[model samples]
Target: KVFSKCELAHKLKAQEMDGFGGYSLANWVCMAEYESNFNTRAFNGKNANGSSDYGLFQLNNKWWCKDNKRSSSNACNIMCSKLLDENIDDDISCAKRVVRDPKGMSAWKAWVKHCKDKDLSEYLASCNL
Candidate 1:
């Protein structure tokens, strides 16, 4: 699904992610924007390690989920393609699992490269949530 930035923000807020592994809703919105541009169907094939990044959060197949020929510990207990769906509940659950670790939001390169130390006010602009 193609959601506007505001729509994404509100949706993340609706999930009440404040205490979900120390990452905020704004953090999630910003990360998703940088990672997938609100395109849930997004996929990044074949990284240098032959792993792929999937869906809105751009989760890696190496550790997060499995793709063909890519074995995973299945931390999220899902196929990487599952994240490509419009229903973000599974995505959200998996992402929460990611942040539960010491890496927190830093697990996503997009978050580290963009949103980690930045002001995300504009990402939530006019969302009124």
Candidate 2:
């Protein structure tokens, strides 16, 4: 399911995720847009190396979750399917773990490719949150 951009910003703020990456609500919303377009069912297909990304965060099977055919460190200790649902608590928790690393939101390729060093205040302004 896809959520409105404002709904996402609201929830992320309610979850205290606004400060992720030491940035405001807009960054998180912007990242979600580029990564999954706010759809919980979003899945980017696997690469030639046989690694895949899942759900709203585009979390990787290589380290973050199990692909069922290969060994996974299961950094979040949850199934990849857990992320492919409507409720995003697990997704948020796991994403929090990701940002805690020194890399912060730099862990997400979309953020690096699209949001990095880009002015995102307009995204927030559009949300009215």
Candidate 3:
């Protein structure tokens, strides 16, 4: 079997990171909760417009996904549950991989702001992910 999302979440927090100086296990939990309800294959079928951003973080087309990255015609094929091997960043990195941003983690400041303002800290403190 492959690494579960929970295991992956801890891995990211410990090594890859969950932003801020402190990875904050809760931060990863919140990300998994808000993004995909902890369902690795969680997908928004209606509100998000039947998007293929299937994954623990819901890395949508507008976020991650490349036209030719996979054999599938669209990003829908990149499901977290179906993944056999993943890099350190996983969805976060895959989301930005194609963008090829030179700044790397720096570009996430805005994203950090958004998540933090959304009560990410409160979530971390509450669940202790």
Candidate 4:
């Protein structure tokens, strides 16, 4: 299910990034655009180990066992709901909730170096609104 970045940005800003408290809503759209091309059902056919990731953000397989159990792609649907909801938080929040074990917001610290870059930062900072 492909969606407009404009619509997605509104939710990402309101819910993600703590209502644009820290980062700009534009940052949320960048990840949304990059990760899935706005395709809510986006996925990789298989991983390096032959596992699959599914949904808008490409949720992985092992985590699906806990959230989806039967299929990795179903877990993506669950994430799509969260992203669709008006409580998306930030890119880090999405990463923490779906990326791996020990899921939570701690992974945000590691993002500073990446998000704070000079050249690449333009994608995120310039989009701030």
Best by TM-score: 2
* Residue 3 Cα positional deviation in candidate 2, in Å, after optimal superposition: 1.1
Native-to-model Cα distance after best TM-score fit, residue 68 in candidate 3, in Å: 10
Residues 1-129, model 3: lDDT tens digits: 234546655666665455543445555554555555555555543333433454555555443443322322434335443422344355655643532456433334434544555654455443233
- Assess the local accuracy of residue 42 in candidate 1 as a C-alpha lDDT between 0 and 100: 85
Best by lDDT: 2
Whole-model lDDT, model 4: 0.46
The better candidate by TM-score, 1 or 2, is 2
> How many times do residue backbones clash in model 3?
0
Winner on TM-score (1 vs 4): 1
Tell me the tens digit of each residue's lDDT in model 2 across 55-120: 888888888887674644598888989989999988988888888788888888888888888987
Using lDDT as the yardstick, the better of models 1 and 2 is: 2
Clashing residue pairs for model 4? 15-89, 16-88, 16-89, 17-89, 17-90
RMSD each, Å: 1.7, 1.6, 6.8, 6.4
Off by over 4 Å in 2: none
What digit string (tens of lDDT, one per residue) describes model 4 on residues 10-38? 45555545233344545444555665676
* CA lDDT of every candidate: 0.80, 0.83, 0.47, 0.46
Cα deviation of 16, candidate 1, in Å: 1.9
Ranking by lDDT: 2, 1, 3, 4
The number of clashing residue pairs in each candidate reads: 0, 0, 0, 5
